């Protein structure tokens, strides 16, 4: 039950006309936001007994942004062809003023000329929904690919006879792939969602962007991390101590002792233990997949509290010598981040909440699994002292973390800072 089946094309055309007419960007954004909110409310009210239906804003988003349409090939009917087809279908006189105006459009766009020509002829109220318009456009594109102009002519005639002059002009602009609503694609994506432009750039597609980023509350962090899935952990950026205080706006930060361990991630679900590396490689065999197998997994099953059943963690793997109680540089595990606990996803939550909940995941046990040692600092002298202590301990350097920083997988920068002597 697609929403586009119940949304007349006239409403979208009127919204686009209002957006174009408005002078200030605020009015255009307000109109687009009102249309999007109405669409989302209708979608929520329609799919009540839903099963994660694959219905989104794509039917209208593709028309709003024709330049990003990759599913449909070239229509094969450009401005000259469109003017000619309007001339034959409307049965205008070849020497009549309208015919010359349509043909002589100075190869004040063609859409305006077509609208003026069709105003006295077209109806006042159309009857085509967004789904029907999309189907007709897809049929036109497919017929152009198949080299069958009769079906293209029939579809164009249907569109002309079942739409109003404003609808004809907007359809012409969509076919030409030139709207110029006064708001850039970036603004449209931003109003649609805060993490839409980057998702579209990385994925290069609109339908996925429309579907995944449907709920405004659910950001890219929630969908970027999934159970039993290998995601890309982020990394810090090298920074100098002399300007360290300028990195986080002079706000309080967290100092962590860097460990020269392999960066890996782990998922716990009952008696199921999954492991993954930064590159997606699976090393579960090294530590086993069940508490009855492996060397490290058996000793950590009891560490987790009863309140923790399903969880995801990320950390560093190293080698530990209990005899000297030492860590060997390039089985002990240090945990410094939790990305999901129980049903809820912790990706949206900032680093402070992750640190707060870390203490409630399991009781640290030296030798097998614990929480990486760290402190809170807000002064350059504290950073210098931490670096000196780390060097005295043979540690490579220090990590500076911003509590306000959020989880943004596959990105460089943010609150993740790596300080080393140089």
């Amino acid at each position: 039950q697609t929403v586009a089946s119940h949304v007349p094309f006239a409403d979208l055309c009127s919204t686009l006309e209002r957006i174009q007419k408005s002078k200030g960007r605020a009015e255009k954004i307000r109109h687009f936001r009102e249309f999007l909110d109405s669409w989302r409310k209708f979608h929520d009210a329609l799919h009540k007994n839903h099963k994660d239906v694959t219905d989104s804003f794509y039917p209208a988003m593709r028309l709003i942004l024709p330049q990003l349409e990759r599913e449909r090939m070239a229509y094969g009917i450009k401005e000259t062809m469109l003017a000619k087809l309007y001339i034959e279908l409307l049965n205008l006189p070849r020497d009549g003023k309208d015919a010359l105006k349509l043909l002589n459009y100075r190869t004040g766009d063609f859409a305006m000329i077509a609208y003026f020509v069709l105003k006295p002829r077209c109806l006042q109220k159309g009857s085509l929904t967004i789904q029907q318009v999309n189907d007709l456009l897809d049929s036109i594109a497919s017929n152009n690919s198949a080299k069958r102009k009769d079906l293209i002519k029939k579809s164009l005639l249907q569109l002309i006879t079942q739409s109003s002059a404003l609808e004809q002009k907007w359809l012409i602009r969509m076919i030409i792939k030139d709207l110029k609503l006064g708001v850039s694609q970036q603004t449209i994506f931003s109003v649609f969602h805060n993490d839409a432009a980057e998702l579209h750039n990385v994925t290069t597609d609109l339908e996925k962007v429309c579907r995944q980023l449907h709920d405004p509350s659910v950001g890219l962090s929630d969908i970027s991390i999934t159970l039993f899935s290998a995601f890309k952990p982020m990394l810090a950026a090298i920074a100098d101590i002399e300007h360290i205080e300028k990195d986080m706006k002079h706000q309080s930060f967290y100092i962590e002792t860097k460990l020269d361990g392999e960066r890996m991630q782990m998922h716990k679900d009952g008696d199921v233990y999954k492991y993954f590396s930064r590159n997606g490689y699976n090393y579960t065999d090294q530590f086993g997949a069940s508490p009855t197998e492996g060397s490290l997994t058996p000793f950590i099953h009891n560490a987790f509290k009863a309140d923790i059943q399903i969880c995801i963690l990320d950390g560093e793997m190293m080698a530990y010598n209990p005899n000297t109680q030492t860590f060997m540089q390039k089985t002990c595990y240090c945990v410094f981040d939790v990305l999901m606990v129980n049903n809820k996803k912790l990706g949206h939550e900032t680093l402070r909440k992750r640190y707060e909940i870390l203490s409630s995941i399991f009781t640290p046990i030296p030798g097998r699994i614990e929480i990486v040692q760290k402190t809170q600092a807000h002064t350059k002298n504290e950073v210098i002292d931490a670096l000196n202590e780390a060097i005295d301990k043979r540690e490579e350097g220090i990590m500076v973390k911003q509590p306000l920083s959020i989880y943004k997988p596959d990105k460089r920068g943010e609150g993740w800072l790596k300080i080393k002597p140089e």
Partner: peptide, 28 residues
């Protein structure tokens, strides 16, 4: 139940300026 219609609404500061216009006709 409702329909799409229900969800989608139908829908002194400054300075004075003076220009002096003078006829240049013979009678003037």
């Amino acid at each position: 139940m409702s329909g799409w219609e229900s969800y989608y609404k139908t829908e002194y500061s400054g300075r004075d300026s003076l220009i002096f216009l003078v006829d240049a006709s013979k009678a003037m």
